[PDB]
Amino acid sequence: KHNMKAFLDELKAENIKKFLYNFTQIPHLAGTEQNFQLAKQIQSQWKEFGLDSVELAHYDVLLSYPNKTHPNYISIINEDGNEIFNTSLFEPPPPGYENVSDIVPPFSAFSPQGMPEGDLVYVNYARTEDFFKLERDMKINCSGKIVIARYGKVFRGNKVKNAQLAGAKGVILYSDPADYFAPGVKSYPDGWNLPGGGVQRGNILNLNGAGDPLTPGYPANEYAYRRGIAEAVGLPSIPVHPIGYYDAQKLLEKMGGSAPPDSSWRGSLKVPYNVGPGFTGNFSTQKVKMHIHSTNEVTRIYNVIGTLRGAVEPDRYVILGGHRDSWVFGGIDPQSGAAVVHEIVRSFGTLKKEGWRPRRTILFASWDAEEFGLLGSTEWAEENSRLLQERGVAYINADSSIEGNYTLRVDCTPLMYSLVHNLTKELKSPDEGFEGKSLYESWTKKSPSPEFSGMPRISKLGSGNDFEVFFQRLGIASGRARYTKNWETNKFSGYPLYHSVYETYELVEKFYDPMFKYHLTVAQVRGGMVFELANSIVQPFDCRDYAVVLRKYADKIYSISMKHPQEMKTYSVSFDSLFSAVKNFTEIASKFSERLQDFSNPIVLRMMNDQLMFLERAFIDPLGLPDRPFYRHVIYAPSSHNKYAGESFPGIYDALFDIESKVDPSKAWGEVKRQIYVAAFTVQAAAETLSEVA
Amino acid sequence: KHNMKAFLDELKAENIKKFLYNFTQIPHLAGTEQNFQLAKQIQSQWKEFGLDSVELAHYDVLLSYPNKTHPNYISIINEDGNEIFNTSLFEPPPPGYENVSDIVPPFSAFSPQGMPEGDLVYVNYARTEDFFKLERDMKINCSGKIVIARYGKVFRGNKVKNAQLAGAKGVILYSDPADYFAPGVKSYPDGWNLPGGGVQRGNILNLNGAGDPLTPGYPANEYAYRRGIAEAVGLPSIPVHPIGYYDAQKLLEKMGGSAPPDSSWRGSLKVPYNVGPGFTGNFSTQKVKMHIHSTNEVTRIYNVIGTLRGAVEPDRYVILGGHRDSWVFGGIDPQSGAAVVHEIVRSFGTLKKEGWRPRRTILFASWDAEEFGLLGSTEWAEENSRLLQERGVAYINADSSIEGNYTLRVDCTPLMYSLVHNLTKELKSPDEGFEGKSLYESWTKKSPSPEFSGMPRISKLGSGNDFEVFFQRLGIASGRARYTKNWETNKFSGYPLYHSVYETYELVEKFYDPMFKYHLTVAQVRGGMVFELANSIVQPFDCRDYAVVLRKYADKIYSISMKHPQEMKTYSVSFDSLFSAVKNFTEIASKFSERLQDFSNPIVLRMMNDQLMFLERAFIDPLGLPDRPFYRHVIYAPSSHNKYAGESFPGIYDALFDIESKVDPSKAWGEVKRQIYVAAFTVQAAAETLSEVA
Numbered sequence A, B: 001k002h003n004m005k006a007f008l009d010e011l012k013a014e015n016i017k018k019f020l021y022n023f024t025q026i027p028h029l030a031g032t033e034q035n036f037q038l039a040k041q042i043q044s045q046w047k048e049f050g051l052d053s054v055e056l057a058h059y060d061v062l063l064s065y066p067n068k069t070h071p072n073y074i075s076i077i078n079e080d081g082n083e084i085f086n087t088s089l090f091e092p093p094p095p096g097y098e099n100v101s102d103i104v105p106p107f108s109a110f111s112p113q114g115m116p117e118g119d120l121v122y123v124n125y126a127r128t129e130d131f132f133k134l135e136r137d138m139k140i141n142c143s144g145k146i147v148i149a150r151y152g153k154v155f156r157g158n159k160v161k162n163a164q165l166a167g168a169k170g171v172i173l174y175s176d177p178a179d180y181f182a183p184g185v186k187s188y189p190d191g192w193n194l195p196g197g198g199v200q201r202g203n204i205l206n207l208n209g210a211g212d213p214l215t216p217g218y219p220a221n222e223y224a225y226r227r228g229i230a231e232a233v234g235l236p237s238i239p240v241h242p243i244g245y246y247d248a249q250k251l252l253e254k255m256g257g258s259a260p261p262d263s264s265w266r267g268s269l270k271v272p273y274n275v276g277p278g279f280t281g282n283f284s285t286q287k288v289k290m291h292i293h294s295t296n297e298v299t300r301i302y303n304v305i306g307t308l309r310g311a312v313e314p315d316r317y318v319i320l321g322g323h324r325d326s327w328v329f330g331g332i333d334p335q336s337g338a339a340v341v342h343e344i345v346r347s348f349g350t351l352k353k354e355g356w357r358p359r360r361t362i363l364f365a366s367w368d369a370e371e372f373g374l375l376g377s378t379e380w381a382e383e384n385s386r387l388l389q390e391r392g393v394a395y396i397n398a399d400s401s402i403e404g405n406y407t408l409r410v411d412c413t414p415l416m417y418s419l420v421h422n423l424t425k426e427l428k429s430p431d432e433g434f435e436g437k438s439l440y441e442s443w444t445k446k447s448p449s450p451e452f453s454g455m456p457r458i459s460k461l462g463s464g465n466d467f468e469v470f471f472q473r474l475g476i477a478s479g480r481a482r483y484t485k486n487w488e489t490n491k492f493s494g495y496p497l498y499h500s501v502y503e504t505y506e507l508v509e510k511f512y513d514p515m516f517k518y519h520l521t522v523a524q525v526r527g528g529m530v531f532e533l534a535n536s537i538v539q540p541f542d543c544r545d546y547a548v549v550l551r552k553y554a555d556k557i558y559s560i561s562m563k564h565p566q567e568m569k570t571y572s573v574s575f576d577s578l579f580s581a582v583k584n585f586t587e588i589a590s591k592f593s594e595r596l597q598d599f600s601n602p603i604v605l606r607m608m609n610d611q612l613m614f615l616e617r618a619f620i621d622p623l624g625l626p627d628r629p630f631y632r633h634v635i636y637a638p639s640s641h642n643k644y645a646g647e648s649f650p651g652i653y654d655a656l657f658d659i660e661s662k663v664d665p666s667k668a669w670g671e672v673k674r675q676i677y678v679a680a681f682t683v684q685a686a687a688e689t690l691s692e693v694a
């Protein structure tokens, strides 16, 4: 029998291991020949595995690379202009890789060129609240200073935006052991911690969903008209470069000026964490100088797109997508995910060869240039937006399958909560101590829901990965799942070796998942979700779960506003319309659910399946959010302060943020009221899509 | 048997006559009690007729009315400030209506208040090319002058925009007998011509699709947040008022300054048509003074929405809509259309009572506030946009059924051309001399296609009526049809009594259609189109006809560009991508048509019906056209110079318009190239929606 169990049983830990090894022997940086060859390999293999068609979709997009013969570095310079200390030109390569070529040295992708020289100011994590503290409380001015910020807490592009707005003339990012070195674990190669020479690569754009900087709204195809660089979207205006903690300690140790305001500003290095500006007296005439010579260049990228045509509803698409490009070897990011996709395709193809097809079409994607701003997924979705918005059922992401070995992590639309609970109750837990128990049982025990007893935590989607175009631009129900660390006992951010040369096959095989049991579990979750979405007669979405969360988010945004009771009185700021809409949505969803359970008629079914499919679509506002036209979902957007985090009722949230500091309160509260009206209207309009249709 | 013939045979000329009489005895100005009572009457009657549900949908929108106790007028004033001549305070009412109350006096809706005094400049029709001629060739400066313009040729709101941009401080609009008095016909009540005391009402907004000025993008419901007046969309900045030709002659007769540049500037009055500025010597110290005291006021409006639920596809909507509000009695505009809608509803309801239902849902709409900027239709479509864009099959407009008695006029999307040809071959011609012949035969003989022998003319949709939101904003296939005059032998614009108090039941019954045979024919065309769209198994759209016109429009826009061969060389301006896309669309549409004709499988059918329904949708660009975010269709928009006219490839057309006058040619030709890329991309993306889906 060809059912979910058949699909799941065909998945093998040993195959995922073999694929991971295969994908991580050489670097696969976007835009390079090595990553085009891997695209061709995956295309060939997916054909072999049994997909109906497998094509490459290419685009020519703006990418950024260091200059191989003019390396980036930072100096401390003396009064004479002698560079008395220089940061490293590369990370010491790991054992057995010291002869691998084409390892890109650490750099911040899309940095402009420059050689700014100046006094340092230390800005903690460079968050909005860190700059508030510096400017408003400490009265420190960053204008014309080079800022040094520790990585962690928020997306690095928000740090750079924050520093630019503070007037910085350059930014130095570094990895503090406080945030990237777990106590009691050894540095790579002897454990999974970041060594002092390790450095985190990553782009520093602020694209807000636009995709390729030069072609917002349209695919970067063969005839595309491109903006000039000066009009490009999202590029930083000041040079930026990342360093490791051995080099950071040399830059921080001499810092003078003001003491850190409190302990939350102190990392773990043996330095005072003085804010500056500049160095202590004896070194007061020394300065820091950056030398950045990277160049931005339009470069071809390649997505692999595989199709498994549906037997009954070929014009409904369930998409499983993850990226293939990596900063270096991509041992965790992305190849731990790409190897799981590859095994999922193999398992679906095995059923296909035996005569099976899914009810709906499944599309499988190997995206390129994710690391440079979600470029491959976004350009493809721009090209195919009409097809996706009328036919797209769901998008399941597949980046890193592991960032720890403790329990499951799922982020998704509320429409998928019930599907995830049900699927995980049918899967076996891979956890020690949970032998013979369900994944739901282990997950719920280790990661309990904050709101509900006996249920596991499922988070909102943020951004910083390839589901962004599908969810926040196009309104297609989306989700992601991976294995993660224990958030209670672990204070570090992400995993320590993120975007470093040390993210290798050996890191995974030795330290994260030697048996590949957590990878297999993630393959079952991602693959199972795709299976259900593509095969279920009635789409496995529960609109009632959206109703529950909408009330939670309404309560939350009301609570923020109610910190300003005088202003709500003065400007007659009422949330009554939003609560009304949420009440209506709850009532209508309940009635729709009754009809759905209680309706042979394939028209009523598909009519009902379309109401389910277009429900996420109904939260899209075609005018977008203020100054962010590609974030169009009214319930969820990436936080304006941290792209990785999701924010609920973002238009109202950003209207309320720091409102007590606005110079014209009447105008500011007017915009809060406008955003309440937009959100209440959008929730009522989404509810009405679930009413009887005539 | 319940088939189209049964529906058509039930339609009766005598019923349309009775309804027209019923709808035109008192004025039904938007926002007034009389028009709310008529809404309630129509709601009651549509229920009686058999519709499943009939509701009122209300909104509170910005409307504009004269001040009843401070009337608008224009004076000639002397040096002492004595007003020596005043324009009329009202049109002489027609026979038997001299005691009717609540006739709104002539005014320009949405004019600001003011009493500007100054010298006149005569600006012909106030078209873009008239202002070019004044400023560029004649070197006449309108800054600080009051301009007087004749009505005709273009929408009055474009005249006022053009005058404001020229620096005018007020605008006087008048009806010249050249444009509103057909030679050899008597003035009302003795014929259908405009008397010298007649005046054309009408709004002078420039909304570009926005709907209510205060709530662009969102319905003007009970909790809507409204812009302040200063931020409202589309309002004029200078006072404007319309007059008849008796009063115009008094204002024009004294004009001095420059002679008219040529005969195309001369109307039919016994005046020189001097351009000015100002009056001839003896009267040089006299000036013209406007007194405008109208007020803009948020006011409730009511749409009636009737539903006839589909038997098989209740979640597919075919909409027949027309407005109900009128300037005065609305004898032609709109009640000649509303009486036809009413009879269509009655005929559908007769079939319904006998047990029939259409395959798809039919929605019937009586829109309000059309006269004030398409407000009722637009606010309703804003409220229901998610339902309409996922379920809307087609929109058939139903404003004035007649503007002459010569032949048929149809404007619609290419997707409807074949349906219209086929339907009109099955209908009887009402024309004298064509007894026993088809409507197709009479229409084709009287109004031959410019492109094709043996085929009738069908025009593009422009704007200035309630299909605008459905077609140019939302991308729903739309059409309209009415009886019209002989365009060859008739030089006047529209019909002469348009928007005057003289547009009465008697005008229609005595002069246009005494037997109501042309109304009946229009009812058969509109009703038949609705019938087919709602009942046909395969939707009656032919994508191949879009391919033919796309090539025509590509050839046209290429020809405009090729007036600038040097610049196309210098800036490498190529149309190759657009022709490629159009070639691809032609190929793909041909293959789709083969599958459609040659495909029992209701999924393949509905899959194919969705490809047909979403094909008009595919021409929508969610980013809109430059500075006109609510005009989103890439193939068709209202002309930027005349809202009534449609323009093809509008984004490229406006990029090319007057390009030789732009100060930075590199930038201007860059934007032409950007618009070529957007159009080529959009045509290819629409083509791809017709490809096999997987």
Ligand SMILES: O=C(O)CC[C@H](NC(=O)N[C@@H](CCCCn1cc(COCCOCCOCCOCCOCCOCCOCCOCCNc2ccc([N+](=O)O)cc2[N+](=O)O)nn1)C(=O)O)C(=O)O
Pocket (backbone or CB within 6 Å): A152, A153, A154, A155, A202, A203, A333, A370, A371, A372, A373, A374, A399, A400, A408, A409, A410, A411, A447, A457, A459, A460, A461, A462, A463, A464, A465, A484, A485, A486, A487, A488, A493, A494, A495, A642, A643, A644, A645, A646, A647
């Ligand atoms: O160009 C681009 O856009 C990106 C390209 C590239 N993409 C990329 O590398 N993506 C990686 C990014 C890895 C990022 C590592 N990272 C994260 C951060 C910090 O950013 C914060 C993440 O958001 C979490 C904020 O939540 C804290 C408040 O909790 C309230 C509920 O959360 C609402 C905020 O929005 C949620 C959406 O995403 C958050 C997912 O995190 C799940 C939270 N789960 C747990 C929470 C608590 C917990 N516990 O025990 O108390 C346990 C949890 N748990 O999952 O077990 N710094 N570094 C990836 O997606 O795998 C790049 O980033 O350079």
Ligand SMILES: O=C(O)CC[C@H](NC(=O)N[C@@H](CCCCn1cc(COCCOCCOCCOCCOCCOCCOCCOCCNc2ccc([N+](=O)O)cc2[N+](=O)O)nn1)C(=O)O)C(=O)O
Pocket (backbone or CB within 6 Å): B152, B153, B154, B155, B202, B203, B333, B370, B371, B372, B373, B374, B399, B400, B408, B409, B410, B411, B447, B457, B459, B460, B461, B462, B463, B464, B465, B484, B485, B486, B487, B488, B493, B494, B495, B642, B643, B644, B645, B646, B647
């Ligand atoms: O707020 C609002 O938006 C509007 C509210 C209100 N709405 C309203 O009152 N609507 C009325 C408006 C009546 C307007 C009367 N009017 C029209 C005008 C002039 O505007 C020009 C109309 O566009 C025609 C331009 O075509 C000339 C170039 O010919 C090339 C092909 O046409 C492409 C231009 O776009 C076509 C879209 O609409 C045009 C429909 O006209 C059909 C042309 N048909 C014929 C053409 C030639 C011919 N012939 O024998 O040579 C015969 C034709 N024929 O139909 O038999 N001035 N006054 C209604 O829709 O019934 C208002 O206007 O105040």
Ligand SMILES: *[C@@H]1O[C@H](CO)[C@@H](O[C@@H]2O[C@H](CO)[C@@H](O[C@@H]3O[C@H](CO)[C@@H](O)[C@H](O[C@H]4O[C@H](CO)[C@@H](O)[C@H](O)[C@@H]4O)[C@@H]3O)[C@H](O)[C@H]2NC(C)=O)[C@H](O)[C@H]1NC(C)=O
Pocket (backbone or CB within 6 Å): A577, A578, A580, A581, A584, A680, A681, A684, B222, B223
């Ligand atoms: C949640 O769903 C409910 C339906 O169950 C829906 O209720 C609707 O609420 C609106 C108010 O926003 C009601 O609107 C009223 O309509 C009547 C005519 O039916 C009007 O006469 C009312 O206007 C008068 O009163 C106003 C308030 O004092 C005045 O401002 C105004 O000047 C008039 O005097 C008013 O427009 C509507 O009738 C109901 N519909 C129902 C019950 O079916 C509610 O709006 C939904 N929530 C959201 C956010 O959409």
Ligand SMILES: *[C@@H]1O[C@H](CO)[C@@H](O[C@@H]2O[C@H](CO)[C@@H](O[C@@H]3O[C@H](CO)[C@@H](O)[C@H](O[C@H]4O[C@H](CO)[C@@H](O)[C@H](O)[C@@H]4O)[C@@H]3O)[C@H](O)[C@H]2NC(C)=O)[C@H](O)[C@H]1NC(C)=O
Pocket (backbone or CB within 6 Å): A222, A223, B577, B578, B580, B581, B584, B680, B681, B684
């Ligand atoms: C109309 O439909 C046709 C398909 O029948 C579609 O043709 C496509 O045209 C594009 C060009 O826009 C082709 O793109 C090429 O793809 C190959 C790989 O397949 C690339 O190697 C090519 O790039 C090289 O050559 C370029 C031109 O000299 C250089 O600029 C570039 O640097 C490279 O050297 C190029 O990208 C594409 O292969 C076909 N697809 C087919 C035939 O299936 C056409 O685009 C459609 N029209 C529109 C407007 O979409």
Ligand SMILES: *[C@@H]1O[C@H](CO)[C@@H](O[C@@H]2O[C@H](CO)[C@@H](O)[C@H](O)[C@H]2NC(C)=O)[C@H](O)[C@H]1NC(C)=O
Pocket (backbone or CB within 6 Å): A021, A022, A025, A040, A041, A044, A045
């Ligand atoms: C990754 O696996 C692929 C697939 O097995 C290997 O590519 C094959 O290599 C052999 C030997 O060179 C060729 O004969 C095949 O044509 C290749 N198949 C393809 C590309 O589909 C590849 O060598 C492996 N890479 C590594 C680093 O182990």
Ligand SMILES: *[C@@H]1O[C@H](CO)[C@@H](O[C@@H]2O[C@H](CO)[C@@H](O)[C@H](O)[C@H]2NC(C)=O)[C@H](O)[C@H]1NC(C)=O
Pocket (backbone or CB within 6 Å): A075, A081, A082, A083, A084, A085, A086
């Ligand atoms: C840091 O690197 C810089 C640049 O390579 C070194 O400065 C150079 O030193 C060489 C040899 O002494 C000179 O010929 C160059 O002119 C110098 N260039 C610049 C820009 O100063 C510097 O010596 C290095 N410092 C340390 C401590 O290694």
Ligand SMILES: *[C@@H]1O[C@H](CO)[C@@H](O[C@@H]2O[C@H](CO)[C@@H](O)[C@H](O)[C@H]2NC(C)=O)[C@H](O)[C@H]1NC(C)=O
Pocket (backbone or CB within 6 Å): A418, A419, A422, A540, A541, A542, A597
């Ligand atoms: C998750 O599983 C639950 C329990 O099986 C499903 O809920 C049941 O659905 C069936 C079929 O409609 C109903 O007859 C039962 O009454 C439901 N039980 C409940 C709600 O406790 C639920 O539909 C599944 N969710 C999915 C598939 O998304």
Ligand SMILES: *[C@@H]1O[C@H](CO)[C@@H](O[C@@H]2O[C@H](CO)[C@@H](O)[C@H](O)[C@H]2NC(C)=O)[C@H](O)[C@H]1NC(C)=O
Pocket (backbone or CB within 6 Å): B021, B022, B025, B040, B041, B044, B045
């Ligand atoms: C237009 O026709 C309607 C419908 O016949 C007339 O309204 C009816 O009037 C009678 C007599 O006053 C009432 O008893 C009915 O209740 C009305 N029906 C409705 C409103 O649905 C109306 O009088 C006619 N108007 C004119 C000007 O002839």
Ligand SMILES: *[C@@H]1O[C@H](CO)[C@@H](O[C@@H]2O[C@H](CO)[C@@H](O)[C@H](O)[C@H]2NC(C)=O)[C@H](O)[C@H]1NC(C)=O
Pocket (backbone or CB within 6 Å): B075, B081, B082, B083, B084, B085, B086
């Ligand atoms: C045009 O109308 C104006 C305004 O009503 C007339 O001027 C008024 O005349 C009365 C009576 O003579 C005076 O008391 C008012 O003060 C005048 N008002 C203004 C604004 O001038 C004027 O007489 C009329 N002209 C003609 C030719 O009828």
Ligand SMILES: *[C@@H]1O[C@H](CO)[C@@H](O[C@@H]2O[C@H](CO)[C@@H](O)[C@H](O)[C@H]2NC(C)=O)[C@H](O)[C@H]1NC(C)=O
Pocket (backbone or CB within 6 Å): B418, B419, B422, B540, B541, B542, B597
């Ligand atoms: C208009 O009528 C024509 C002629 O009947 C229809 O075209 C025919 O369609 C049938 C059914 O698919 C085909 O078998 C014939 O070959 C077609 N004849 C042609 C193209 O000459 C056409 O489909 C009708 N258009 C509509 C209904 O939109």
Ligand SMILES: *[C@@H]1O[C@H](CO)[C@@H](O)[C@H](O)[C@H]1NC(C)=O
Pocket (backbone or CB within 6 Å): A067, A068, A069, A070, A295
């Ligand atoms: C890189 O640096 C070299 C050596 O100084 C220089 O010649 C070249 O222009 C640079 N390359 C790029 C792509 O800018």
Ligand SMILES: *[C@@H]1O[C@H](CO)[C@@H](O)[C@H](O)[C@H]1NC(C)=O
Pocket (backbone or CB within 6 Å): A141, A142, A143, A144
């Ligand atoms: C910060 O420093 C610069 C002077 O170099 C000045 O332009 C800016 O306004 C200062 N801001 C303050 C003191 O808030």
Ligand SMILES: *[C@@H]1O[C@H](CO)[C@@H](O)[C@H](O)[C@H]1NC(C)=O
Pocket (backbone or CB within 6 Å): A192, A404, A405, A485, A511, A512
């Ligand atoms: C794997 O799990 C063990 C047991 O809790 C833990 O000590 C170790 O830190 C984990 N490895 C990683 C990379 O988290």
Ligand SMILES: *[C@@H]1O[C@H](CO)[C@@H](O)[C@H](O)[C@H]1NC(C)=O
Pocket (backbone or CB within 6 Å): B067, B068, B069, B070, B295
């Ligand atoms: C209309 O004019 C009268 C009389 O001069 C004035 O009192 C009133 O304010 C005006 N009405 C409006 C609505 O402006």
Ligand SMILES: *[C@@H]1O[C@H](CO)[C@@H](O)[C@H](O)[C@H]1NC(C)=O
Pocket (backbone or CB within 6 Å): B141, B142, B143, B144
């Ligand atoms: C038209 O007149 C005004 C002077 O009142 C002036 O400001 C404007 O620039 C003039 N334009 C010309 C002469 O082109």
Ligand SMILES: *[C@@H]1O[C@H](CO)[C@@H](O)[C@H](O)[C@H]1NC(C)=O
Pocket (backbone or CB within 6 Å): B192, B404, B405, B485, B511, B512
């Ligand atoms: C009706 O048709 C006759 C015959 O051509 C014509 O003379 C008359 O002008 C028409 N009436 C109108 C209003 O066009």
